Each structure stands twice: as C-alpha cells, then as structure tokens.
Amino acid sequence: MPIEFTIQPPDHYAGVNEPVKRPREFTCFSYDRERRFHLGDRSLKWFYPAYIPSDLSRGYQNWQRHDDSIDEHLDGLLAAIADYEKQTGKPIDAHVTTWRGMMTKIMATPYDQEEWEMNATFYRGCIFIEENHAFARRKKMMESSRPARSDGISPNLMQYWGYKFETLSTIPRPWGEVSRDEIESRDDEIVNNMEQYCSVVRTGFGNTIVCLGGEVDAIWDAKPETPGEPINWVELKTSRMITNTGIQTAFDQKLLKYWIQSFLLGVPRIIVGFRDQDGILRSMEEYETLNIPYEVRRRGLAKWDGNVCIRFAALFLQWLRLNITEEGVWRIRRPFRGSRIELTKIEQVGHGAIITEEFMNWRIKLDLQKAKQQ
C-alpha cells in the first residue's frame, strides 16, 4: 500500500498556539559572483534605498544568471553545519535538516492548491529533505511552453524586475565607508544572482528541533556583539502597483508566503518595491514580520492564519519522524488540488545525491570521537 497524510481544512488545526523556539543563526556562508562557496559573511550587503523613479527593465540583456539546470542538492548547508560541528566538538541537536523552500511549501499546504514534489532520506537518526529537481525542471519547461499574455510580459522579465531592485537597493559596506559615486552610479551596475549570503538557523516546532538553510538579501546595521541575539535583516521583494482592491486580494494572498519566508529565518523587516505594468519603479514600502498577519486579518480580504501553518508543520514533521526510520530515499508528493500528501520509498539504500560523502565521513569521524571520548 502507499502511505498518505490527509490535509484537513484549516478549521481542523486552528485555535491551538503550538510553540516555536525562536530562530538562532549559528553558522553562515557565501557564494561569490562566480559561484565559489566560502564560509562566513563576505557576500552580505547593507540596505540603502533606490532612486524612486527608475526603470527596472534597464540592462536586461546583460543579466548574469545562475543556471538552474545545475543541481546543488544541500551541499552548502551540509558544509556550513559540518564546520560548526568541527568548531564545537559535538553534533547539532537538530534532527531534521532542509532548505527553507520546502518548509514554506509544507507550511503553505493547508491553503495553497499548487502541486509540489520532494525527495527525503534518513541517516543516523536524522532526516534530510530536498525538492525533486526533475519535477521542478519539467514544470518550468511546461510554464515556458505556455502562450504569452496580451500585455507581452515575459516571466523572465518579471524575474529580472526581481533582481534589478535588489541591485538598486543595496551597498557593499555600511553607509559610513562607501563613497558618494558608489551610491549614485548603481542604476548602471550589471545584475548577478549567483552571488548570495546563506544563513543557517536552529529552530523548532513543538517537540521537534529543526535546522534550516536559506538566502537573506541584506542587513540594516552591523551583526550583534555575541551570537543568538536578534539581527536586523531585510528581505527585498517586487510586485505591480496596487491600483485597485482586486490587486489587493492577490497581494494579501502573496503575504502568506512572504510572512512564512521571513519568519523562518527571524528576518524582522520586509521592504517591497512597486513597479508599474511597463517596469518603472514607482514606490517602496516597509512591513514588519511580526505584524503582516495582523494587517491581513484587519483588512479581511484574504483568509489565512499562521498558527494553522505552524501546527500543521509540527504534525507533518512528527508524521515523517514516525513513518521514516531507515536509510534509502523516500518521495513525498502533493497532487494538484490533492487532499492527501503521498509518501513512498523509491530507493532502498544510500542517499542518491541528497548527502555528500564528505558529510558521511565527517559524521563517521564524529561517532568514532564519541566512542574515543567515552
């Protein structure tokens, strides 16, 4: 028989305030413009705002793209954790490890109708999760095979109107150290999205403790003097101007995923840029990650509440910890408008490519150190 988890209506999970253990950054890593991995914060940027009227379509022909046909699995996240374990002389206490994107798709599942598919594996009492890259690529081939809209807006142009706004809105050092010309000239810098800062956080829902990796765009000031204190991160986003309440509905539905995505890494502030339908930037606004659900609740135009997502994630993670107990690879799938998540064991032994041999060799060395210490 196949194994299945039933997605109840939100009403079934609601009204219970399941506890969340506040996110702590405990290791971090950078990608540079040429996609070399480096430990630490060398690719982090400071926020500093754009010139209000500017053309987001400017420079589209020169955009340096990360090639999503390349599959990176978990590689940077496992490496950054393995360094923290080497520095501390102990395994981390988290027993589930993943990219934030899977955590978002899980937490959105009670409300979102979209299909998603994942590969997962178990090793030495710990669980690891990734998106199925083949499913993602096939879906993106099908989406790029659709006929164009009457406005002519390419999804690729929408995605460039993403990353251009991040280059217009950042600086490579705190405001005290950059020159004037390095702020004024930014309209003419060529955009790159291979360069990233990834933050790794320890977090937990109810009884289960989880380690999340994810991208963070920028910081508002300096990192704090000692670990584990709240950090003034910023997330930067773009969307069309809210010209009428029909757009406000779609925006207040986007805010569910924005809130989850910034909540899971403790990012306190979102800054949103609004384009017109040709691509000119027209305004910017500030939102606080604690208050987004409260504002959407107060407008009442969209019907979601994060306590459902949190408890659904806790129950689902616990259900994975009950059903998955041995090595090999499992596939998790959510059919389009499907009322049940599907689970199946697809490979009997090993990890496919979800885990590096370097990570296996490090954990083997660490368990040999536990035996030698005892």
Q: Does 284 interact with other proteins (rule: CB under 8 A)? A: no
3-state class of 249 per DSSP? helix
Cβ distance to Mg ion smaller for residue 271 or 355:
271
Find the angle CA(32)-CA(38)-CA(40) to the nearest 5 degrees: 105
Cβ distance to other proteins smaller for residue 15 or 172:
172
Binders of Mg ion in range 191-220 (CB under 5 A) = 217
Q: CA 319 to CA 338: how far, in whole Å? A: 18
Q: Per CB under 8 A, which region of 144-152, 218-226, 273-281, 334-342 contacts other proteins?
A: 218-226
Q: CA 216 to CA 262: how far, in whole Å? A: 9
Q: Does 174 interact with other proteins (rule: CB under 8 A)? A: yes
Binders of Mg ion in range 229-288 (CB under 5 A) = 236
Question: Which of 15, 19, 40, 49 is the binder for other proteins (CB under 8 A)?
Answer: 49
Q: Binding string to other proteins for residues 125 to 164, with x set by CB under 8 A, is what? A: ----------------------------------------
Q: Given strand 218-219, what is the order of strands in its sheet?
A: 54-55, 280-288, 269-275, 233-240, 218-219, 46-47, 170-171
CA torsion sign, 34 to 216 to 359 to 327? negative
Nearest Cα neighbor of 39 from 88, 79, 74 is: 79
Q: Which residues pair with 123 in a beta bridge?
A: 126
Q: Which residues pair with 140 in a beta bridge?
A: none
Phi, psi torsion values for 5, nearest 5 degrees: -115, 120
3-state class of 29 per DSSP? strand
Q: 28 near 80, Cβ under 8 Å?
A: yes
Q: CA 205 to CA 357: how far, in whole Å? A: 29
Binders of other proteins in range 181-200 (CB under 8 A) = 183
Cβ distance to Mg ion smaller for residue 215 or 342:
215
Q: Does 221 interact with other proteins (rule: CB under 8 A)? A: yes
Q: Per CB under 8 A, which region of 7-15, 41-49, 189-197, 359-367 contacts other proteins?
A: 41-49
Q: Does 282 interact with other proteins (rule: CB under 8 A)? A: no
222 binds, among Mg ion, other proteins, none (CB under 5 to 8 A by kind): other proteins
Number of residues that bind other proteins (CB under 8 A): 16
Question: What residues line the site for other proteins (CB under 8 A)?
Answer: 47-49, 51, 174-177, 179-180, 183, 220-222, 224-225
User: Which parts of this chain interact with Mg ion (CB under 5 A)?
Assistant: 217, 236
